[PDB]
Amino acid sequence: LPKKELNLYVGMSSMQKKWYKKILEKDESKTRLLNIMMQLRKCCNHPYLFDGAEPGPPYTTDEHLVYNAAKLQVLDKLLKKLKEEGSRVLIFSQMSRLLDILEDYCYFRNYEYCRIDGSTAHEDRIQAIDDYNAPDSKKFVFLLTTRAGGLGINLTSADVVVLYDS
DNA sequence: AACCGCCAAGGGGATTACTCCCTAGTCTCCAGGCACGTGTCAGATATATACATCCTGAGCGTAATCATGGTCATAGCTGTTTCC
């Protein structure tokens, strides 16, 4: 059985277009751009990563996060579809900090999962893998990094794997 | 949460060649600024008064202390009662 591949070209969120211009035109201000590569990469990845895109002193946790994000709207659609389809999904990303927001947004949707990140533990890696690969595991999603997570482990219990970033 | 390894990629510091035009040296020139006389004014001088202010009690207020009274507690005395 082969594998399918689709590249979900989604438009960059209009809400963060303010800050994306604020990065291109150097408009928010008075910070580093020593690696314009990464700065645009983080804005390409997620807006709240720039330390002030989340204005709330209580830091509200609601649909605004998926609202202000370009990708998570398609993610929310695909998570709803794959939940009914029973697809056991794996998510890969580069920024461990971004995964915190996904961990927070996983809490919002109340999914079971296990978060493996660079330098979590030794026994925690084993146990989180076991719970995810446990038979009939309801851990519908699985947070994982890119350069720390997928270098030899087998996840045949899963079928669909999604990249947040390239 | 520092440390350390790791990872790729712009980024700008380095190097080479060249051009050029601006500053240097000279040189001609002259009036600006510096010495050189001089009066006048604004600080210095010399009193006198006005005033602030400190000093030390003139006195006044305040509290601290001793005096003084009243009051209650306890002890002593005796009268009453009951018992043999």
Side-chain angles (χ1 to χ4, degrees), chain A residues 116-122 125 145 148:
Chain A
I116 300 299
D117 201 304
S119 74
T120 52
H122 182 74
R125 295 181 185 271
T145 68

Side-chain angles (χ1 to χ4, degrees), chain A residues 73-148:
Chain A
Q73 294 176 359
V74 179
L75 276 296
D76 184 358
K77 284 272 271 153
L78 180 59
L79 289 178
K80 291 185 285 181
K81 284 154 146 163
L82 294 185
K83 186 180 176 183
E84 299 172 355
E85 298 181 0
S87 296
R88 182 68 179 271
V89 68
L90 302 178
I91 310 166
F92 298 159
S93 173
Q94 299 292 141
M95 294 299 291
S96 68
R97 311 181 74 255
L98 184 134
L99 288 181
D100 291 330
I101 318 185
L102 269 67
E103 183 178 1
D104 291 336
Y105 174 71
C106 292
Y107 170 71
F108 183 80
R109 294 178 65 88
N110 293 314
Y111 293 173
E112 295 188 357
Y113 62 96
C114 276
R115 183 177 178 179
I116 300 299
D117 201 304
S119 74
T120 52
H122 182 74
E123 52 84 19
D124 203 358
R125 295 181 185 271
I126 289 164
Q127 68 94 52
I129 282 295
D130 298 349
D131 283 336
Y132 192 74
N133 277 9
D136 183 28
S137 175
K138 189 62 180 67
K139 292 184 175 66
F140 173 64
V141 298
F142 189 74
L143 293 180
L144 190 47
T145 68
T146 309
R147 186 175 64 248

Side-chain angles (χ1 to χ4, degrees), chain A residues 23-40:
Chain A
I23 303 165
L24 286 175
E25 277 81 5
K26 284 82 68 178
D27 303 323
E28 190 276 331
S29 63
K30 299 165 75 71
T31 57
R32 295 291 186 269
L33 293 175
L34 287 178
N35 197 356
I36 314 166
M37 294 194 229
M38 296 299 102
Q39 304 302 323
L40 294 173

